PDB file of N, CA, C and O in Angstrom:
ATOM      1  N   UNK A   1      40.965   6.793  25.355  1.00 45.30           N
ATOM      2  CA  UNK A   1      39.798   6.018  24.972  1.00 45.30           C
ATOM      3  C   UNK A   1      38.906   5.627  26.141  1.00 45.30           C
ATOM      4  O   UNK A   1      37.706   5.385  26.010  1.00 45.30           O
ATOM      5  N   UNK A   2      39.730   5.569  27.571  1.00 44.76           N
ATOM      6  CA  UNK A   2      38.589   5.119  28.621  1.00 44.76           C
ATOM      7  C   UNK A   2      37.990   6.158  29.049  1.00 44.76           C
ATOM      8  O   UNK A   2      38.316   7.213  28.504  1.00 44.76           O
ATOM      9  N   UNK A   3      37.259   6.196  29.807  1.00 43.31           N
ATOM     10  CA  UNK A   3      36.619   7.562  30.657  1.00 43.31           C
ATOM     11  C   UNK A   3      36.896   7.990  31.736  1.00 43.31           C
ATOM     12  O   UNK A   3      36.541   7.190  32.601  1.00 43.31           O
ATOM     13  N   UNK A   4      37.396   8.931  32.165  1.00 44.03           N
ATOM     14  CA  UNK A   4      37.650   9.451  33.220  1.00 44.03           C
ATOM     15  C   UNK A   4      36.757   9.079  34.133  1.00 44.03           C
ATOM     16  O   UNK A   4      37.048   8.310  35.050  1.00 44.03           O
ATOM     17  N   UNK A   5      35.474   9.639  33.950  1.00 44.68           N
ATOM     18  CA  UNK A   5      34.621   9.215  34.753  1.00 44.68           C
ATOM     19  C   UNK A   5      33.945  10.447  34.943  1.00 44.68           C
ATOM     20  O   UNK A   5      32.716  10.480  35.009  1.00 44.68           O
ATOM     21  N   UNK A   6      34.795  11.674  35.053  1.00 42.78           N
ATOM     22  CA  UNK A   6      33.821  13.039  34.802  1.00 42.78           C
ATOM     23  C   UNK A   6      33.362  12.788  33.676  1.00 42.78           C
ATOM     24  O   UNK A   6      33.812  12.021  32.825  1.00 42.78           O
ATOM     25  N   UNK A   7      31.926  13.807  33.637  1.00 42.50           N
ATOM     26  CA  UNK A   7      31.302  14.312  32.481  1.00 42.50           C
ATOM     27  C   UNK A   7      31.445  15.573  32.315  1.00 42.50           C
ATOM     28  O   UNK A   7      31.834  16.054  33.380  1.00 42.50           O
ATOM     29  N   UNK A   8      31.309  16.482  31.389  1.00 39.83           N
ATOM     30  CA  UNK A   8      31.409  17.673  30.639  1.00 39.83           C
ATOM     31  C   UNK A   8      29.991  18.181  30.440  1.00 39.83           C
ATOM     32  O   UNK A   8      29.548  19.173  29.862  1.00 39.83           O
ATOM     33  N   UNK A   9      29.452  17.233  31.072  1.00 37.31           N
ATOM     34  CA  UNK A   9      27.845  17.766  30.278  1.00 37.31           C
ATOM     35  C   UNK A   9      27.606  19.458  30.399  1.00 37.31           C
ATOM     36  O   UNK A   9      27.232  20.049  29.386  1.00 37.31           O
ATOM     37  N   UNK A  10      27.880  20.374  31.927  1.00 32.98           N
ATOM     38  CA  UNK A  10      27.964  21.552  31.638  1.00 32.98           C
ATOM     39  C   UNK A  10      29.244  22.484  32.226  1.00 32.98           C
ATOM     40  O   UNK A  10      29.359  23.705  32.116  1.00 32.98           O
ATOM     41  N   UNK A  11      30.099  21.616  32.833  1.00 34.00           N
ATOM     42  CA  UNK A  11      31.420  21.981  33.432  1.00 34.00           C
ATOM     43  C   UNK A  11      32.068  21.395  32.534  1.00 34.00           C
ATOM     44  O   UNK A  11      31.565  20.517  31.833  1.00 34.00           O
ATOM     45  N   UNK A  12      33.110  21.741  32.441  1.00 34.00           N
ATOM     46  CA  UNK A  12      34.201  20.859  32.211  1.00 34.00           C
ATOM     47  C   UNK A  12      35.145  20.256  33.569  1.00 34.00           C
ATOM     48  O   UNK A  12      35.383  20.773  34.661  1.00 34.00           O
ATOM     49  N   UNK A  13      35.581  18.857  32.941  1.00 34.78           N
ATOM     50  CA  UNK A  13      36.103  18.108  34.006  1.00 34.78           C
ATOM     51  C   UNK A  13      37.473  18.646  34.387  1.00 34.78           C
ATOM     52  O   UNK A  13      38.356  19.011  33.610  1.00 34.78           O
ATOM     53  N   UNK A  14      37.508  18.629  36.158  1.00 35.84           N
ATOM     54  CA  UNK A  14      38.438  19.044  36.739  1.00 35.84           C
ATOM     55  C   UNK A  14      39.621  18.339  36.798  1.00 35.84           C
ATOM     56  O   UNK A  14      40.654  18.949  37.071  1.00 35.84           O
ATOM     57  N   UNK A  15      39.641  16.911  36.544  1.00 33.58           N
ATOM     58  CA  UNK A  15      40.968  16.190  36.767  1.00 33.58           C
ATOM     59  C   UNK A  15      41.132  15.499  35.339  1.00 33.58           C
ATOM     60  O   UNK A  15      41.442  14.342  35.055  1.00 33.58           O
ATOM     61  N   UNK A  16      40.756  16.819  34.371  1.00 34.67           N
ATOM     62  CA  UNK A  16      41.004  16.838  32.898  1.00 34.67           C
ATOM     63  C   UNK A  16      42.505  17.022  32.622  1.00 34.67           C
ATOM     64  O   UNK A  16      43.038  16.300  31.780  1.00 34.67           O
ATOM     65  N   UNK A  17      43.101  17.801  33.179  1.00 35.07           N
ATOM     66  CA  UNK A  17      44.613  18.017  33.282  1.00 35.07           C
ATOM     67  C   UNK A  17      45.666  16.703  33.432  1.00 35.07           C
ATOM     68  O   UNK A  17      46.859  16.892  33.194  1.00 35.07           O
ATOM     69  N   UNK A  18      45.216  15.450  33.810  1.00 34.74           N
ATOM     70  CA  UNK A  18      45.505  14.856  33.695  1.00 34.74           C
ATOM     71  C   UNK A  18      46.146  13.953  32.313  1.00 34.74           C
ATOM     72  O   UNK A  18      47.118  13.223  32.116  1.00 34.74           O
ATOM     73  N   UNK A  19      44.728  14.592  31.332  1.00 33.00           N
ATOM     74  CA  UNK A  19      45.450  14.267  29.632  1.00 33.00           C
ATOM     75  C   UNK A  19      43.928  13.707  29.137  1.00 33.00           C
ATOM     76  O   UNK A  19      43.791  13.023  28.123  1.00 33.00           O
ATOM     77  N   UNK A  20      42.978  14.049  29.887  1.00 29.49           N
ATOM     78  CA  UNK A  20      41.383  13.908  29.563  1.00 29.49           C
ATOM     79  C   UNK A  20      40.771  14.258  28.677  1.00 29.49           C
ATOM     80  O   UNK A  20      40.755  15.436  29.035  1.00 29.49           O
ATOM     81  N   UNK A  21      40.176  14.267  27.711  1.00 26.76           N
ATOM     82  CA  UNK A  21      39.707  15.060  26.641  1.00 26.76           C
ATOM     83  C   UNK A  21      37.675  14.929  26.901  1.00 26.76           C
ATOM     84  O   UNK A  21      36.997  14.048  27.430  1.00 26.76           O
ATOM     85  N   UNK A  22      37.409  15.845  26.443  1.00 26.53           N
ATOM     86  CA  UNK A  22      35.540  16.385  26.498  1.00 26.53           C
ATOM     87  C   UNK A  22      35.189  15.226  25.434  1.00 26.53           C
ATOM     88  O   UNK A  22      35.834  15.216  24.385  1.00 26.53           O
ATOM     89  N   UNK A  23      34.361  14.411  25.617  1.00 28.41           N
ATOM     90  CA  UNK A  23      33.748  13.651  24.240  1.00 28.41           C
ATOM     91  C   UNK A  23      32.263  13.013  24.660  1.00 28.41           C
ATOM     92  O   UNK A  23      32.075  12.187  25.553  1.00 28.41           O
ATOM     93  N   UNK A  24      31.443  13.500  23.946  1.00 27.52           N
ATOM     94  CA  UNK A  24      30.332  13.291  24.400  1.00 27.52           C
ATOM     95  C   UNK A  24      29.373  13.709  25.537  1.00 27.52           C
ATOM     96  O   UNK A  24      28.337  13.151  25.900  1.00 27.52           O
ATOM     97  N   UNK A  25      30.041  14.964  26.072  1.00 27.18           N
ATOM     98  CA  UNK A  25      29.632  15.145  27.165  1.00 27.18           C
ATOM     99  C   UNK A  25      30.095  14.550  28.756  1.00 27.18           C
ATOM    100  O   UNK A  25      29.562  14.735  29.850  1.00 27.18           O
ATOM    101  N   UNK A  26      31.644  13.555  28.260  1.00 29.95           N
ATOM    102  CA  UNK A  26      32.097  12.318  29.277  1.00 29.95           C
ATOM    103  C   UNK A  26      33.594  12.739  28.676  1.00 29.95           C
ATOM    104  O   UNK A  26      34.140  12.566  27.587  1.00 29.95           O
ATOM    105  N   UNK A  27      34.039  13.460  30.086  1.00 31.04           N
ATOM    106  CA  UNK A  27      35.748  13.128  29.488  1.00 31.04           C
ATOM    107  C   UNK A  27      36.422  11.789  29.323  1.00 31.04           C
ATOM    108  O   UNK A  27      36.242  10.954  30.209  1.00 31.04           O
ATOM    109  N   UNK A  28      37.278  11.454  28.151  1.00 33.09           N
ATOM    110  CA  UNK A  28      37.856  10.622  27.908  1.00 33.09           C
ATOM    111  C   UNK A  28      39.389  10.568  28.514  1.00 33.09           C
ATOM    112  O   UNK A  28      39.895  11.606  28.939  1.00 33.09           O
ATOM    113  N   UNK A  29      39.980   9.546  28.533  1.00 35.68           N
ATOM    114  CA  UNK A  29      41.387   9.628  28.374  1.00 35.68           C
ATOM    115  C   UNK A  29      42.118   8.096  27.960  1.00 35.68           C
ATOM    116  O   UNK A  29      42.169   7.071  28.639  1.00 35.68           O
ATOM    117  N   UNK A  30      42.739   8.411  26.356  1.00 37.27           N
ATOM    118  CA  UNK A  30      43.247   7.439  26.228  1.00 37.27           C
ATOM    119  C   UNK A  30      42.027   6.209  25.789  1.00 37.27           C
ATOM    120  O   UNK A  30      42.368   5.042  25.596  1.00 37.27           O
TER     121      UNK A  30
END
């Protein structure tokens, strides 16, 4: 539910592996 803090807007986020999910253009996690 919080944000990683990357955005997705045209990458996807790199320290997504962490358990991050794409939402809105702003990875989430949790």
């Amino acid at each position: 539910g919080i944000p990683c803090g990357e955005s997705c807007v045209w990458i996807p986020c790199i320290s997504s592996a962490i358990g991050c999910s794409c939402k809105s253009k702003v990875c989430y996690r949790n």
